[PDB]
Design a protein around this nucleic acid. Structure first.
Ligand SMILES: Cc1cn([C@H]2C[C@H](O)[C@@H](COP(=O)(O)OP(=O)(O)OP(=O)(O)O)O2)c(=O)[nH]c1=O
Ligand SMILES: [Mg+2]
Ligand SMILES: [Mg+2]
Ligand SMILES: [Zn+2]
Lengths: 196, 645, 222
DNA sequence: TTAGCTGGTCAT
RNA sequence: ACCAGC
């Protein structure tokens, strides 16, 4: 609510996520950090523009509340600044689904994440139609729900021409397939999938 | 000989997933670890160690660890996997017989242990006692989640696999190995002429004592009958609860109008406190201020109040003379409710989905080898002589298990031994009076003719009195059994001491064997010991707690072991006769209280075969140890555990 | 929970004092225990005493464990009932006296229940409408089987009962006792009981309390 | 000088 | 301290 939270006024620390299964070097590469404000420990994601200039945080508490730290745009993807080329991206849905694929692929293939979810994906896909003309394929990795299939069917409309391929999961989404040991499936569903 | 440790997701009641496992070997010295995807390799390593003729060392392996593997290997990858019971050994069943006394030696060490681990045979407590403990998984995981910030939900941290689980599993198998070396570093049970880390399953079992073999067989069988359960009727105990919960809510309405309220001193602050019959202070106050003198002072300023002084109490007001009986009935109904349905360990809070009760049975919990029963205690439900007793034992039946192939109920057989410790007495003192006492026990019933000779009202009172006299009473506690004074409490002692003058000679023999000097203090006792232990029937060092209970720990510790071998032999004959144990076979054990057994079987002919072969098993027990008496049992047949008492 | 016995340091027994996992002791000889208005009525401010309701019939321990305390401010006799939340915090109250002066103090939420800060898992729950009927069922069952009651009367059974859905989803069977019924509670999980008097207290004050306990355990389906 | 071996209960 | 059991 206040500003971009400086780390010095929030006692910034980069560590792992033991309940989720993500190391410290992945969270160091992305920007996902842990702060101590008002006593209660808060996890906080760190957005940037395409240049790399810091404009927004997003804070979740011990029971997953939402705390936005300013003007939350629609042309801001989680980790958009990290990649400016390549041949494939894996558009996830949450923010730990981005970290999980950066863990299971060792920061090699580009992975970006959306800052709204399945509520306004089209709003942040049609307004991000100009970022995707520097890649070659798009592998949509959404939730395996009614809302996930609805979001991928409505979001396969305002993406670029015919490059969209949709990967399927046996879990709810990617992090439970990481926790239950299904690291063999999501390494195949990135490489091949069933199209529109 | 390998030492292997498991880690899975939950308890044996509901387990579906394997997480990790570590194996150490005594021939290659290798911490061969495994992963969640290497469960087939884990089972192949264990089956190779079985097939070459070795021993697998678990910890708490008979109860949890081996049937967890048999459940996971079926319902995760569809393969049968059974370990033969002469290959798996445990290091908790060994600890419960070698270190059978931790509460009396654990003081002086509590400086090491936290305080919650005082007298615990768990694997972490021996990690604190061996001074080899590097952290704890639950505390470090809770601290790590408080350090990230995500909450700690339910105390369930075996959901997801990680690396700290494997690390503390490696430390777990370190603690198991360091316990096994000390447990095999004992000389009274394991002779120091052979190394027990390379011998087979025909040398390890039969080149040592018999108490190391009978205890593992007993732990195997009691874990199996724990996995079977006890069939239980829920509707017939909810009817009882709705019956006698509308009686203690009438015995307080009818009673607070008789015994009125009063002001109690909390400028003098007072409170309007009312009569609570469950308290033994309010009844004491209201009986003092209504004209009653106790004439019995256990406490230094307060009387004693129980069922034997609430009978012999008289007051002037003839309303209170009727009210005291309602007070006693209210205390009875309160205890029955708190045992049956409202307690923290009630019966209706330990009924599974399939309508059965699973209670833990520790095979060696007492110092004298007597099993203890817990969670819930199925050894102390009310008998058929107490009020509301048959209605509580008629729910614990074996006819409440309708068959899964024909839809028919089963039959129950119950077998009790007769005159067990009283006949072990005639075994032990037959070298003094030349065996002219062990002939009258075999000539007719003992307790009935003892009741005739002592003019007691009931056989139960004669049976209480004879053991009360035998296990070193005083002048008054066997006069209290008949209600009379210490004059009759002296003449009964003289009458049953001058009949057979060998009990005092046996007691003098035990005193000359164990104790050598006992200095007297006017408020205490200072004794220099010579042998604190007694060799039992199979070489086990039975610990003697007090020098006037030596006859007790000589009789009941030799009486428990013949029942412990009897319950093993009466299935070793039934499986070899051509039957099948379990619910999907022909018979199943249900409960083993201190003397009798309860078995439930499919047809009446199988009941008759079991009730025949129990006699042959008991006679083989009586022949294997060369008793000077002749052991004998008695069996009954019925639908539930009210006729089969 | 129970661990073992310690020697009692005060009354001087050997196996009398019992030690528990929470760090406290308890002796069975000496009985010693060791270790709107927008203004919440503080318990020391209002001369609060946990007295009994003799003319209706309710003990003292029920009023202690359910939080129903008598206030003596202004020289009069209030019966203040505390409502709470899941964390264990006083949120709102109700002050009542003989003239039904229902002073609702504190932030009175729209979906508050009376006695929900005690219970999370179980097979049954008995939902009544008032507070004296809820205390009556806790009198009969001795404060150990779960009974909650609505915080807005019998006119918010579609509002107070509806916003609590994941709370009543935690249990296997929900039993209603209103006035001799709601369906926003989950499907196949609503039983409705039938009594011969006006409510539970009238069955308690006439000896028909068996027909309270018989309808908790054998209730019919909706 | 002592009947014995267990479990289960409780209040701020 | 009380109750229940073997
Ligand atoms: C009643 C009682 C029994 N016991 C022991 C001795 C008993 O032999 C053993 C089993 O108890 P019981 O089976 O009740 O006695 P019993 O087997 O000798 O007589 P019967 O079976 O013919 O009815 O428990 C005590 O130690 N103290 C006691 O107070
Ligand atoms: Mg283990
Ligand atoms: Mg017997
Ligand atoms: Zn005390």
């Amino acid at each position: 609510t206040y500003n971009v939270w400086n780390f010095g006024e929030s006692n910034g620390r980069y560590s792992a996520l033991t309940a989720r299964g993500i190391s410290k070097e992945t969270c160091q590469k992305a920007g996902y950090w842990i702060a101590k404000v008002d006593g209660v420990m808060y996890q906080v994601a760190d957005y940037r523009d395409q240049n790399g200039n810091i404009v927004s945080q997003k804070v979740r508490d011990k029971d997953k509340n939402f705390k936005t730290t300013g003007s939350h745009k629609s042309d801001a993807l989680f980790g958009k600044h990290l990649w400016n080329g390549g041949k494939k991206i894996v558009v996830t849905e949450g923010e730990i689904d981005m970290l999980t694929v950066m863990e299971l692929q060792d920061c090699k293939y580009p992975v970006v994440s959306l800052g709204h979810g399945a509520s306004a994906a089209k709003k942040t896909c049609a307004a991000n139609y100009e970022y995707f003309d520097q890649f070659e394929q798009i592998i949509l990795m959404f939730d395996m729900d009614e809302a996930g299939r609805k979001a991928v069917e409505e979001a396969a409309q305002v993406l670029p021409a015919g490059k969209v391929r949709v990967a399927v999961l046996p879990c709810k989404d990617a992090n439970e397939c990481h926790l239950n040991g299904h690291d063999r499936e999501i390494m195949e569903q990135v490489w091949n999938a069933g199209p529109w | 000989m390998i030492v292997s440790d498991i880690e899975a997701n939950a308890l044996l009641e509901s387990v579906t997933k394997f997480h990790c496992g570590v194996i150490y070997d005594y021939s290659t010295a290798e911490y061969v670890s495994y992963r969640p995807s290497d469960f087939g390799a884990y089972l192949d390593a264990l089956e190779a160690e079985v097939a070459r003729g070795g021993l697998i060392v678990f910890h708490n392996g008979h109860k949890y660890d081996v049937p967890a593997l048999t459940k996971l290997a079926k319902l995760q990858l569809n393969r049968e996997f059974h370990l033969p019971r002469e290959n798996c050994i445990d290091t908790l069943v060994l600890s419960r017989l070698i270190h059978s006394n931790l509460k009396d030696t654990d003081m002086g060490l509590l400086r090491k242990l936290p305080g919650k681990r005082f007298g615990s045979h768990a694997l972490e407590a021996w990690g604190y006692r061996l001074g080899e403990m590097k952290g704890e998984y639950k505390d470090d995981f809770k601290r790590m989640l408080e350090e990230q910030g995500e909450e700690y939900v339910d105390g369930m941290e075996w959901w997801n696999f990680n690396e700290e689980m494997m690390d503390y599993n490696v430390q777990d198998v370190v603690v198991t190995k360091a316990l096994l070396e000390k447990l095999l570093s004992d000389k009274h049970y394991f002779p120091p002429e052979i190394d027990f880390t390379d011998v087979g399953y025909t040398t390890f079992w039969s080149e040592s004592l018999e108490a190391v073999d009978i205890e593992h067989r007993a732990a195997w069988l009691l874990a199996k009958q724990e996995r079977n359960g006890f069939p239980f009727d829920t509707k017939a105990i909810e009817e009882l609860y709705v019956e006698l919960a509308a009686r203690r809510s009438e015995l307080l309405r009818k009673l607070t109008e008789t015994f009125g309220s009063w002001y109690q001193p909390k400028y003098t602050p007072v409170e309007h406190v009312v009569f609570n019959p469950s308290s033994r202070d309010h009844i004491q106050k209201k009986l003092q201020e209504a004209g009653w003198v106790p004439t019995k002072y256990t406490d230094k300023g307060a009387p004693v109040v129980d069922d034997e002084v609430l009978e012999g109490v008289r007051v002037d007001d003839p309303e209170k003379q009727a009210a005291i009986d309602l007070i006693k009935e209210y205390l009875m109904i309160q205890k029955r409710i708190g045992q049956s349905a409202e307690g923290d360990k009630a019966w209706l809070r330990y009924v599974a989905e399939d309508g059965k009760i699973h209670g833990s049975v520790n095979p060696n919990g007492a110092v004298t080898g007597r099993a203890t029963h817990a969670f819930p205690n199925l050894a102390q439900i009310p008998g058929v002589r107490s009020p509301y007793g048959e209605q509580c034992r008629a729910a614990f039946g074996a006819e409440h298990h309708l068959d899964g192939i024909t839809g028919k109920p089963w039959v129950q057989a119950g077998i009790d031994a007769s005159g067990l410790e009283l006949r072990c007495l005639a075994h032990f003192m037959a070298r003094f009076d030349n065996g002219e006492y062990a002939h009258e026990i075999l000539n007719g019933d003992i307790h009935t003719k003892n009741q005739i000779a002592a003019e007691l009202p009931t056989r139960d009172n004669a049976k209480t009195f004879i053991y009360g006299f035998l296990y070193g009473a005083g002048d008054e506690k066997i006069g209290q059994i008949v209600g009379a004074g210490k004059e009759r409490g002296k003449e009964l002692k003289k009458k049953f001491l001058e009949n057979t003058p060998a009990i005092a000679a046996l007691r003098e023999s035990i005193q000359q064997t164990l104790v050598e000097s006992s200095q007297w203090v006017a408020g205490e006792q200072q004794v220099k010991w010579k042998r604190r232990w007694i060799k039992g029937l199979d070489g086990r060092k039975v610990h003697v707690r007090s020098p006037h209970a030596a006859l007790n720990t000589l009789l009941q510790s030799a009486g428990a072991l013949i029942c412990k071998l009897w319950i093993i032999k009466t299935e070793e004959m039934l499986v070899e006769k051509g039957l099948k144990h379990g619910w999907d076979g022909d018979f199943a054990y249900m409960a083993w209280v201190h003397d009798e057994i309860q078995v439930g079987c499919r047809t009446e002919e199988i009941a008759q075969v079991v009730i025949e072969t129990a006699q042959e098993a008991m006679r083989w027990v009586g022949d294997h140890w060369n008793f000077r008496c002749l052991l004998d049992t008695e069996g009954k047949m019925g639908p539930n555990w009210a006729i089969c008492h």
